[PDB]
Amino acid sequence: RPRFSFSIAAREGKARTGTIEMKRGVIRTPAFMPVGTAATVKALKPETVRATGADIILGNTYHLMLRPGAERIAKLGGLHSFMGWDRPILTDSGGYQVMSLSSLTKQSEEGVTFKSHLDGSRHMLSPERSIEIQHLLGSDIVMAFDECTPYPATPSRAASSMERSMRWAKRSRDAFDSRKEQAENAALFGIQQGSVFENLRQQSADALAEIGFDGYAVGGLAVGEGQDEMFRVLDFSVPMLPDDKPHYLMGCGKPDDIVGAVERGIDMFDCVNGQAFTWDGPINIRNARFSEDLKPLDSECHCAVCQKWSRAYIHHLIRAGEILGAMLMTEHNIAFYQQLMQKIRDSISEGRFSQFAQDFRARYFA
Amino acid sequence: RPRFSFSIAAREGKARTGTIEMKRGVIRTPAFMPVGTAATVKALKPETVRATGADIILGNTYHLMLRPGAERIAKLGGLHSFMGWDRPILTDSGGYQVMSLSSLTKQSEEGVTFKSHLDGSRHMLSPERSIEIQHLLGSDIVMAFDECTPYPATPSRAASSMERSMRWAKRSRDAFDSRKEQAENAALFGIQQGSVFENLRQQSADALAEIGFDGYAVGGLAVGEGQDEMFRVLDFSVPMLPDDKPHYLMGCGKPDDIVGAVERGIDMFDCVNGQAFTWDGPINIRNARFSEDLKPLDSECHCAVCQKWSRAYIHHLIRAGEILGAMLMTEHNIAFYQQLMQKIRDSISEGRFSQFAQDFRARYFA
Ligand SMILES: [Zn+2]
Ligand SMILES: [Zn+2]
Numbered sequence: 001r002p003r004f005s006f007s008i009a010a011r012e013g014k015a016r017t018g019t020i021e022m023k024r025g026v027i028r029t030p031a032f033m034p035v036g037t038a039a040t041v042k043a044l045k046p047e048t049v050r051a052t053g054a055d056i057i058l059g060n061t062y063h064l065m066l067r068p069g070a071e072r073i074a075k076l077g078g079l080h081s082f083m084g085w086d087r088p089i090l091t092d093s094g095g096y097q098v099m100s101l102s103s104l105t106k107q108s109e110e111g112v113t114f115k116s117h118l119d120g121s122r123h124m125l126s127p128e129r130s131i132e133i134q135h136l137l138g139s140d141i142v143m144a145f146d147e148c149t150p151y152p153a154t155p156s157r158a159a160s161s162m163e164r165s166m167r168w169a170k171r172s173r174d175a176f177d178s179r180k181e182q183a184e185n186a187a188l189f190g191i192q193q194g195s196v197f198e199n200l201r202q203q204s205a206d207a208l209a210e211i212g213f214d215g216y217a218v219g220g221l222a223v224g225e226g227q228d229e230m231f232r233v234l235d236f237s238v239p240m241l242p243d244d245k246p247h248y249l250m251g252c253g254k255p256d257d258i259v260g261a262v263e264r265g266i267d268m269f270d271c272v273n274g275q276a277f278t279w280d281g282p283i284n285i286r287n288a289r290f291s292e293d294l295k296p297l298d299s300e301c302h303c304a305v306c307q308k309w310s311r312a313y314i315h316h317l318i319r320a321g322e323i324l325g326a327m328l329m330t331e332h333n334i335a336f337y338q339q340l341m342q343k344i345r346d347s348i349s350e351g352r353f354s355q356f357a358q359d360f361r362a363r364y365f366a
Numbered sequence: 367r368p369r370f371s372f373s374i375a376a377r378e379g380k381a382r383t384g385t386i387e388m389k390r391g392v393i394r395t396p397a398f399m400p401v402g403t404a405a406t407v408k409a410l411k412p413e414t415v416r417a418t419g420a421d422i423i424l425g426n427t428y429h430l431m432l433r434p435g436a437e438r439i440a441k442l443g444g445l446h447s448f449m450g451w452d453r454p455i456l457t458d459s460g461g462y463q464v465m466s467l468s469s470l471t472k473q474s475e476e477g478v479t480f481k482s483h484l485d486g487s488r489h490m491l492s493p494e495r496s497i498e499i500q501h502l503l504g505s506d507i508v509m510a511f512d513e514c515t516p517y518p519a520t521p522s523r524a525a526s527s528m529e530r531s532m533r534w535a536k537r538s539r540d541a542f543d544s545r546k547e548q549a550e551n552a553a554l555f556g557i558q559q560g561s562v563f564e565n566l567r568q569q570s571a572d573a574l575a576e577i578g579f580d581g582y583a584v585g586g587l588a589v590g591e592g593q594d595e596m597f598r599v600l601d602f603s604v605p606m607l608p609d610d611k612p613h614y615l616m617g618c619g620k621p622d623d624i625v626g627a628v629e630r631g632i633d634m635f636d637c638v639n640g641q642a643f644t645w646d647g648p649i650n651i652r653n654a655r656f657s658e659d660l661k662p663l664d665s666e667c668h669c670a671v672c673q674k675w676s677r678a679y680i681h682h683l684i685r686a687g688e689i690l691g692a693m694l695m696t697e698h699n700i701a702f703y704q705q706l707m708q709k710i711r712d713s714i715s716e717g718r719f720s721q722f723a724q725d726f727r728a729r730y731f732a
Contacts, residue, residue, distance in 0.1 A: 323409040
């Protein structure tokens with residue numbers, strides 16, 4: 001396999017389906033990436049993550065650099081070996097979690113210094129150091145380091161952070177390229193910023209395309225703006241990105257967010273305890289109504305959890321705070337997301353995705 | 367298969383190896399039973415419990431009667447169906463945990479009333495109600511309901527509790543026998559009491575043998591007396607029990623407790639977070655010395671955890687409080703216990719168990 005090859009096999013409207021080929025495996029798109037925080041997808045062995053249908057997982061750099069440490073992971077053979085996942089891993093830059101989880105943060109044009117939320121130890125991230133950490137982890141898809149824009153943001157502040165992010169995108173590009181082993185074996189994605197402002201989104205897309213990346217993320221969304229606004233911004237933002245590269249929407253999308261985002265040209269998603277997804281909408285398994293319900297979590301789901309255990313049992317486990325409850329809920333939910341992606345891929349391939357989206361929504365929100 | 371058939375295939379000294387055949391499966395002896403508390407063996411799917419080599423698990427009645435409730439479990443099809451374990455289950459009587467976990471406990475000749483430690487709700491257990499609850503769960507091996515003797519106990523109080531326990535053993539026997547479905551499909555074990563006193567142990571063994579049970583537990587040990595005293599009591603107590611029925615030592619035994627107990631004629635064991643068992647003794651995986659240790663938990667262990675992950679990774683997970691850490695530690699530890707039992711069974715079958723016990727101890731305590 002090549003370092004990186006994105007191929008589009010079929011299209012419907014703005015939606016696309018295809019594959020990303022990388023050295024460690026093929027990723028089917030549109031893709032959902034389960035999130036591994038501190039070198040683990042919560043409550044699941046990697047084999048179970050794979051069994052749900054995942055082709056790639058996300059690793060959170062911020063958590064990894066704190067524990068067990070990036071240099072330590074490299075000494076131990078890299079993240080894949082450490083956690084036992086041998087397929088592609090996309091690593092985030094660490095920037096967002098520094099902003100949201102760390103303390104005593106000090107921002108500058110060079111980067112950010114901060115104190116750990118775990119031990120109060122002092123740490124640093126810059127475009128160069130973020131790219132280096134992602135190299136030390138052995139990441140397959142590296143994210144450029146940027147400066148996030150809070151929602152809501154004034155036009156001036158959104159412009160300032162977008163402009164800094166684009167300067168940092170060039171620094172990320174250059175750091176990645178100067179490291180031969182990384183440049184030859186991994187891919188680098190840039191992140192579009194600009195808040196909800198069309199002109200800033202356009203400037204950001206232009207800057208990123210001029211630098212050139214293997215893929216393009218839409219950053220700065222899923223941060224409190226709501227689905228209507230997110231969809232409105234995606235409507236104008238995604239067409240600004242190069243068509244022939246993957247488009248990655250960063251941040252937890254509910255099933256309905258994913259469907260609408262695919263309708264708007266997004267190819268990749270991520271999303272990190274009593275809520276269970278079903279085709280008739282989410283249920284909270286803690287609800288007393290499930291205490292004697294012998295049906296599986298979802299009536300159609302092909303996951304191992306739905307083949308073997310009842311709502312009543314999972315209700316009991318979750319109410320009791322049992323570890324197996326978290327294990328079963330997480331496996332089902334990730335499996336549900338993967339089945340959603342498969343239905344999306346198949347419907348685009350068959351030119352009936354618009355109908356699928358309508359049918360999905362009618363039932364999910366009935 | 368029969369309701370119950372214990373066959374002894376080989377012997378060495380007081381040690382025995384053989385099988386218990388029951389309707390739901392064959393149990394190889396000496397046997398280790400992983401413990402399921404509130405209808406789950408902590409952090410493990412039943413398939414994983416089976417994969418470690420377990421033939422039978424223990425279910426804790428006290429926890430089950432509180433949550434989700436015995437009648438509820440029966441309505442839902444029984445414990446096996448509820449939790450997804452289709453092989454034999456031995457249920458305890460609930461008595462010990464009432465004494466150790468419940469509040470506002472009131473004891474009498476009829477039984478015990480108590481308040482839940484979870485919700486403060488009022489509950490009752492008697493020989494009759496305990497046997498009924500075990501029936502509602504669908505238990506394969508039912509334990510007689512007894513009155514535990516604290517350690518240390520005066521000769522008078524040990525005698526009183528032993529005598530009451532024997533009266534309750536007869537009541538348990540009669541309750542079990544009067545329920546046709548239970549009598550025909552399950553087995554009933556009696557529990558020897560008498561604290562550390564040889565004469566009381568003898569009276570208890572005689573009373574139990576006169577009533578007649580399918581198996582005999584040594585109760586009242588592993589409660590603070592220490593291994594030397596436990597072994598001393600087993601030395602005289604086990605020979606008092608009928609030779610041709612299984613002998614069950616109740617309560618957590620470390621690997622060395624199990625080896626010594628088998629040397630003294632015990633056939634069955636149970637035992638319910640950073641401690642990992644190895645053939646060179648236990649290690650605490652939290653210790654900083656393991657942070658960069660790429661070796662598996664144990665160098666010989668054939669478990670899936672030791673095939674796939676390092677001490678360094680498990681150290682990280684446990685220090686981070688990650689659920690996967692508990693999952694991996696528990697699978698390895700139960701698998702270690704099962705490998706211990708297999709080595710015990712094979713060595714008795716080959717007439718080299720005494721040598722095995724010596725070799726095991728020399729290395730485990732080196
Ligand atoms: Zn499912
Ligand atoms: Zn192991």
